[PDB]
Enzyme design. Structure first.
Site, PDB file in Angstrom:
ATOM      1  N   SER A 229       2.427   7.084   0.659  1.00  0.00           N
ATOM      2  CA  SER A 229       1.341   6.263   1.710  1.00  0.00           C
ATOM      3  C   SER A 229       0.100   6.485   1.098  1.00  0.00           C
ATOM      4  CB  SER A 229       1.686   6.483   3.108  1.00  0.00           C
ATOM      5  OG  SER A 229       1.260   7.858   3.290  1.00  0.00           O
ATOM      6  N   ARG A 230      -0.505   5.468   0.666  1.00  0.00           N
ATOM      7  CA  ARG A 230      -1.929   5.559   0.131  1.00  0.00           C
ATOM      8  C   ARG A 230      -2.863   5.659   1.153  1.00  0.00           C
ATOM      9  NH1 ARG A 230       0.745   2.458  -3.361  1.00  0.00           N
ATOM     10  NH2 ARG A 230       0.141   2.579  -5.594  1.00  0.00           N
ATOM     11  N   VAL A 231      -2.815   5.202   2.467  1.00  0.00           N
ATOM     12  CA  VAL A 231      -3.669   5.313   3.344  1.00  0.00           C
ATOM     13  C   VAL A 231      -3.390   6.532   4.111  1.00  0.00           C
ATOM     14  CG1 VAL A 231      -4.267   4.483   5.706  1.00  0.00           C
ATOM     15  CG2 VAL A 231      -3.588   2.742   3.734  1.00  0.00           C
ATOM     16  N   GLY A 232      -2.190   7.304   3.896  1.00  0.00           N
ATOM     17  CA  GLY A 232      -1.923   8.633   4.484  1.00  0.00           C
ATOM     18  C   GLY A 232      -3.191   9.585   4.421  1.00  0.00           C
TER      19      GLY A 232
ATOM     20  N   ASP B  17       0.749  -1.317  -0.216  1.00  0.00           N
ATOM     21  CA  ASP B  17      -0.103  -0.026  -0.072  1.00  0.00           C
ATOM     22  C   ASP B  17       0.935   1.290   0.187  1.00  0.00           C
ATOM     23  OD1 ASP B  17      -2.947  -0.890  -0.039  1.00  0.00           O
ATOM     24  OD2 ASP B  17      -2.038  -2.028   1.849  1.00  0.00           O
TER      25      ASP B  17
END
Lengths: 249, 240, 283, 119, 124
Positions: A112-115, A87
């Site tokens: 960071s995609r979840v960031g 991810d």
């Protein structure tokens, strides 16, 4: 329902061992002699980390796989496969490490995609400004060899970038609480730190932590309780009170 | 040879040296024999068992409670690029790397050790000493700045930019030439006897040259001379 | 070629491109101050011209501006050139212009001599052995009047002493940020102006000879300084434009090299896989 | 067969000088592409000036190619080739336009072509 | 002389790249350009020309001591050939001493002959 942190110290060595095993078992080779299901091997591994929904036990498992590259060759087969699977990524640069950037985390090639939702409001309120400043400073780092640019605003970018780099530096085995990170990032972004010498910023942050331990219990407790920034005026008051006593050397 | 070293470190608990010259040949011979053994080839024609073959040898050279083996062993890098699997796989086993570099060796700058790529996890303030750590990081820093000047002076010239350029360039190249030492072995190539300099004298002379005690001393005096007193003596001889 | 060669070539081109970009930025910065210096100097020359257009007194007895046209003796040429290269056609234009014009206008070294400003001009007039008699070098990147006055006083006194009875100067003219033109402009022995009679007050006693020797040398000095500021502005503009073009060319070359590198990559991967599979197919 | 004792001393010298100038031009072309012709040294400028003319003059119009274009072919003896290249290297034709050296036979053809052109 | 020649050529090598753009190269370092060009011209010879070691080392000594740095780079090859002829004419004692003792002869005795050849030599 518990939360587990898993760190694999080297995925590349697992890949090499599986390649050797497959070749000895006389299975058909592939690209760089890797077996036909090497991607499936790492997908099986990194897909088991998840955050379980409410209907199941509310536990989670998080992973930090490691990849070792030779001479920065980020185009290799296993590094590309892992970058596709994961991810996100953070890219540590040896040149930056040697030049003095101790964590060596390159903010340009790290994503960071979840960031976002993975942060608290206090840090989210200040992260964007720091990211923007560092991104702007990246280009300007190529002009510092020339003695002066004839406008202060452009040189202000160089100064602020240097102060950012000095703030972000850290030593071994001394992690910092997130509230004390939020406070210092706020100090950097609001210009309180802009008048301090570069060699003095590193000592300044530690002296600021000491001053916080002296007279900021309410601020730290408010941050811990509400995950949100305290009163802006009171925080500015505390920071200027500390600057009233810290001495430039 | 490793078994002979192991006998000494196990039966008597001594501290033993193990100098292995061009360990790359070990893996190269393994690669030569694997194909004839009937094993299927690997990525760059090496053997499938390269990693385990290296590890079985390397992990036996470790310190124990009774004794301790230390080993200085050279690496051959084919085509002068560190991306080949044979030199790449051996990095994980090393605690200190002394990277000799061409385009430093080309000026005859022996022992051609690169102050930049040379790394060792023993360089920590609480182990080597705070003053030693400060001096080492300071000399690394002042050598770092010089390399960036090279490109801009290639396109302009040495004298084009003057922002503290005299001071920074002087500091850089005087240390860079000072890092080159005359070896006792080097008599076979130059006749001139070598010199032995201890760590205390090294750090002291580096503190002097860093603060500028010898800012006016010649560049060639720093090259291939050893101790700072020898430097000043030879500079006085050549420079009247 | 080899992958290592192509990659090293790409990296070298990248570093050269970045350095040229930094050079363009600093050149533009220096222009940003040369322009304001020239603008701030303009009103001084405006005042000097306003004063001059009263001191003429019609057909006055002044030796300098009355078109003496005595038998020409050692025509003086003044060239304004840069101390540093990397500016494109800036210096080549002015030097080729002066050479081409003087070759047609005059024949022998007794009929001309040269005044040189800038390293490239003096080096050119040395390698092609020409009669240069007075020169100065390494002027600061943003000159003031005091810096040039030392040379210009002597240049004007040279005409005062019955030498260099015909005088011309060459300098690039800041027409635009993109366009810079090489002008030829006549100097004090060929003085001409347009304004009619007026009245003003600065040492405004009608004493013709006194106000004459007070003014005219200073007028020549001011005109020289203005032309020098114009030339410096032109130099900065030329340098920035040339560096922009250099960065563009480097980018195009990098693009082509990336295409070649990608094709080499896929060829090498194909070769390696084919060799591995062929070796495996045996046993 | 290109040896001084086989082809002649003058032939060998002319050939070596031509190769040297062409090699220098090939070396300089990278800088020329990257940052233009402006910043070349004066000697390098003349080297390029003669190298382009030599490279164009190496061309020739064949008898076979007379069907693609109306120009008839030409047969050039070795003596004339050597003399023409020596004259070009010695600076006799530094003032000619460089397009006058393309697809021609002996050296006099260059002069007459240039006179037929705008010269 | 091998070490000094090697070091001088190695030092001369790098600055040639910078010499293509900069004009502010020091006059004292222009002597490096001159000496490097002299060495590069000295280190050429034609096909099938074996040279004995004594005459091979005499010219190297003359070059490294600056005895020919005053001759233009164009004329170095003729300098070389006529110098070998001059040594065959007069340097019999020098050649014999070198061939016998494998050591350089006294710098005075050889320098006198070098200076004699220098004043004899015509430059084109």
């Amino acid at each position: 329902g518990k939360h587990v942190l898993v760190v694999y110290d080297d995925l590349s060595k697992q890949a090499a061992a599986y390649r050797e095993l497959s070749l000895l078992l006389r299975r058909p080779p592939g690209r760089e002699a890797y077996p036909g299901d090497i991607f499936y091997l790492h997908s099986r591994l990194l897909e088991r980390a998840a955050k379980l929904s409410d209907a199941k036990g509310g536990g989670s498992l998080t992973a930090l796989p490691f990849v070792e590259t030779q001479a920065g060759d980020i185009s290799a087969y296993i590094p590309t496969n892992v970058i596709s699977i994961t991810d996100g990524q953070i890219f540590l640069q040896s040149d930056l490490f040697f030049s003095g950037v101790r964590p060596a985390i390159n903010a340009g090639l790290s994503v960071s995609r979840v960031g976002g939702a993975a942060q608290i409001k206090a840090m989210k309120k200040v992260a964007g400004t720091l990211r923007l400043d560092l991104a702007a400073y990246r280009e300007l780092e190529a002009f510092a060899q020339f003695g002066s640019d004839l406008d202060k605003a452009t040189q202000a970018k160089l100064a602020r970038g240097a102060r950012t780099v000095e703030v972000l530096k850290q030593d071994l085995h001394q992690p910092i609480p997130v509230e004390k990170q939020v406070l210092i990032i706020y100090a950097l972004t609001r210009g309180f730190l802009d008048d301090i010498p570069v060699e003095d910023v590193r000592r300044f942050e530690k002296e600021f932590y000491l001053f916080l331990d002296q007279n900021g219990q309410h601020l730290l407790e408010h941050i811990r309780t509400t995950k949100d920034l305290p009163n802006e005026d009171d925080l500015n008051k505390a920071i200027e009170a500390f600057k009233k006593t810290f001495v430039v050397s | 040879g490793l078994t002979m070293a192991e006998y000494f470190r196990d039966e008597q608990g001594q501290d033993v040296l193990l100098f292995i010259d061009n360990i790359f040949r070990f893996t190269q011979a393994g690669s030569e024999v694997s194909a004839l053994l009937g094993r299927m080839p690997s990525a760059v024609g090496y053997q499938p068992t390269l990693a385990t073959e290296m590890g079985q040898l390397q992990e036996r050279i470790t310190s124990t409670a009774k004794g301790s083996i230390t080993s200085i062993q050279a690496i051959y890098v084919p085509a002068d690029d560190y991306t080949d699997p044979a030199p790449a796989t051996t990095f994980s086993h090393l605690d200190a790397t002394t990277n000799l570099e061409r385009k430093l060796a080309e000026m005859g700058i022996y022992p051609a050790v690169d102050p930049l790529a040379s790394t060792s996890r023993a360089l920590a303030p609480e182990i080597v000493g705070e003053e030693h750590y400060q001096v080492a990081r300071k000399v690394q820093q002042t050598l770092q700045r010089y390399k960036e000047l090279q490109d801009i002076i290639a396109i302009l010239g040495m004298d084009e930019l003057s922002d503290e350029d005299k001071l920074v360039v002087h500091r850089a190249r005087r240390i860079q030439f000072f890092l080159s030492q005359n070896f006792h072995v080097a008599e076979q190539f130059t006749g001139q006897p070598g010199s032995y300099v201890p760590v205390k004298e090294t750090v002291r002379g580096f503190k002097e040259i860093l603060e500028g005690k010898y800012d006016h001393l010649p560049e060639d005096a720093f090259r291939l001379v050893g101790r700072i007193e020898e430097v000043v003596e030879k500079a006085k001889a050549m420079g009247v | 070629a080899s992958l290592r060669d192509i990659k090293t070539r790409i990296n070298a081109t990248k570093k050269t491109s970045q350095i040229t970009k930094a050079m363009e930025m600093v050149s533009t910065s220096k222009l940003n101050r040369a322009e304001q210096n020239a603008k701030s100097f303009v009103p001084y020359m405006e005042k000097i011209q306003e004063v001059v257009a009263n001191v003429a007194l019609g057909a006055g007895g002044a030796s300098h501006p009355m078109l003496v046209s005595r038998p020409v003796k050692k025509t003086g040429y003044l060239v304004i050139t840069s101390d540093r290269g990397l500016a494109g056609a800036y210096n080549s234009n002015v030097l080729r212009l002066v050479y081409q014009t003087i070759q047609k206008r005059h024949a022998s070294p007794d009929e001309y001599a040269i005044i040189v400003i800038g390293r490239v001009g003096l080096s050119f007039f040395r390698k092609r052995n020409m009669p240069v008699i007075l020169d100065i070098t390494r002027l600061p990147d943003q000159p003031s009047f005091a810096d040039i006055k030392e040379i210009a006083r002597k240049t004007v006194g040279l005409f005062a002493d019955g030498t260099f009875d015909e005088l011309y100067m060459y300098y690039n003219h800041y027409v635009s940020a993109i366009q810079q033109e090489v002008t030829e402009r006549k100097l004090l022995p060929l003085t001409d102006l347009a304004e009619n009679k007026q009245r003003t007050v600065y040492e405004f006693e009608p004493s013709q000879e006194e106000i004459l020797d007070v003014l005219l040398p200073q007028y020549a000095e001011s005109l020289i300084y203005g032309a020098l500021l114009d030339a410096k502005a032109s130099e900065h503009a030329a340098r920035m434009t040339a560096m922009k073009n250099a960065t563009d060319n480097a980018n195009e070359l990098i693009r082509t090299l990336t295409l070649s590198y990608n094709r080499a990559r896929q060829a090498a991967i194909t070769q390696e896989i084919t060799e591995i599979v062929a070796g495996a197919n045996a046993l």
